[PDB]
């Protein structure tokens, strides 16, 4: 996350971090239930073998709420394509169930029509993660969150050098220096409604981080609600 603030105690409890062999974060995730994590399909081509970490806010110490989980089944969308990042979505089934507590809890799944007319027409969404702090920096040791305005579909297409499919949306800023970034991928885009937080996207791609004239691109979760429901059943 370029810009934004730290997540304070209890504020981003649905964050999940995908970790490689070196206990090193390379992608984010969203806790959907005691057994399921939502992430980006393109994250699965970034580590031979990985685990899932939840309950963590500072990777440089133990605050006592941390929990690591092994993955039993990886469920990747079959229509996912490396060439455009279309259908960039996957669910992970965990070997052991997540025990909810301070800093560990799920985000809610919305229903499609209500989310598209009521959530997605809200001024902003919220993206969070342990990714780079600026295009050329290192990853954050602190979990961060950032408020990102929804971006008109038409402008987003004009601004983009790459194709924006019906399965994607745009958020972020035209010029201001705040955006998601490298390492935040597969992470949560949630929208707040009456003190309740609903999943609205997954961090997918961008032409750098916070570049003038470019927006952040996210997987349109609302197009995938039936697919998520199926995957969560086997």
């Amino acid at each position: 996350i370029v810009g934004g603030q730290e997540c304070k105690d209890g504020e981003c409890p649905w964050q999940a971090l995908l970790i490689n062999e070196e206990n090193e974060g390379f992608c984010g995730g969203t806790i959907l239930s005691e057994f399921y994590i939502l992430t980006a399909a393109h994250c699965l081509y970034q580590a031979k073998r990985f685990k899932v970490r939840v309950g963590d806010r500072n990777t440089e110490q133990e605050e006592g709420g941390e929990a690591v989980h092994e993955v039993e089944v990886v469920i990747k969308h079959n229509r996912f394509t490396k060439e455009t990042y279309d259908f960039d979505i996957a669910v992970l089934r965990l070997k052991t169930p997540i025990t909810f507590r301070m800093n560990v809890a799920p985000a809610c799944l919305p229903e499609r029509d209500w989310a598209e007319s009521t959530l997605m027409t809200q001024k902003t969404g919220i993206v969070s993660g342990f990714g780079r702090t600026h295009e050329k920096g290192r990853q954050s040791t602190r979990l961060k969150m950032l408020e990102v305005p929804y971006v008109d579909r038409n402008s987003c297409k004009l601004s983009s050098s790459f194709i924006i499919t019906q399965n994607m949306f745009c958020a972020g800023y035209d010029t201001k220096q705040e955006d998601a970034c490298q390492g935040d991928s597969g992470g949560p885009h949630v929208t707040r409604f009456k003190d309740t937080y609903f999943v609205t996207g997954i961090v997918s791609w961008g032409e750098g981080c916070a570049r003038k004239g470019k927006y952040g691109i996210y997987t349109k979760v609302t197009a995938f609600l039936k697919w998520i429901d199926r995957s969560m059943k086997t």
């Binding site: 209890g10 504020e11 981003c12 409890p13 909810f100 507590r101 301070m102 800093n103 560990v104 809890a105 799920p106 985000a107 809610c108 799944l109 919305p110 229903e111 029509d113 209500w114 007319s117 009521t118 409604f193 009456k194 003190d195 309740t196 937080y197 609903f198």
Partner: protein, 51 residues
Amino acid sequence: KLCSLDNGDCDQFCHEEQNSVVCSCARGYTLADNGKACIPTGPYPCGKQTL
């Protein structure tokens, strides 16, 4: 009008059925007596920051 007038007064999901607002809630919540509010059924319900 209806779901477009302040969310139909619903806490969560709003749906129109024949000139009438119908409220509902995400999984883990049950609809309140007044057919509008969503009540958490157990601890650590989805979408809530932990305290």
